Amino acid sequence: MDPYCPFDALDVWEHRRFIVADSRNFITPEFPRDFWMSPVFNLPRETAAEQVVVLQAQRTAAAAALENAAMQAAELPVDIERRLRPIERNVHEI
Amino acid sequence: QRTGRSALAVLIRACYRLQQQLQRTRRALLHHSDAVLTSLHHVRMLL
């Protein structure tokens, strides 16, 4: 698991003034690596398909209530013509 | 005597029953729209 590197180590001392050819070192933490713990990404069990099932069941349940309300409100036009026509005839009797 | 007193009876029966005909429509058309409101309300519940 060691990355390949031909060269071991080299040395020409670090005078703060004489910095030339500005490269950048690999910045590392001071803590032992063992707690830089492992990669884990876990799925939500509710799947893109499962939410489809749940929301479709909800849509189909709501459609029944919408149809119930429509059929409750679809009888009012029958009520108007069932209630007012006899009243119009009674007025006509005069 | 019996002519004019019986002629107004038709109008009496007409008016005292037209007073009820509209009361029935007051009651019958309000106990029905409340069902529509309750149904809309239930549909709002489902969401």
- Residue A13 exposed, middle or buried by CB count within 10 Å (0-12, 13-18, 19+): exposed
Which of B11, B36, B42, B45 to mutate against chain A (most A CBs within 10 Å)? B36
Overall residue count recorded for chain A in this entry: 94
Question: Angle A79-B20-B9 (CA atoms, 0-180°, nearest 5)?
Answer: 130
What was the experiment behind these coordinates? cryo-EM
CA–CA gap between residue B26 and residue A4 (Å, rounded): 93
In angstroms, what CA-CA distances link A12 with A15, A19, A60? 9, 11, 77
What is the DSSP-derived secondary structure letter of residue A4?
P
Note which residues in 60-79 of chain A have CB less than 8 A from chain B: 61-62, 65-66, 68-69, 72-73, 75-76, 79
Identify the H or E element spanning A64. helix A48-73
Say which amino acid occupies B36.
Answer: V
Nominal resolution in Å? 3.1
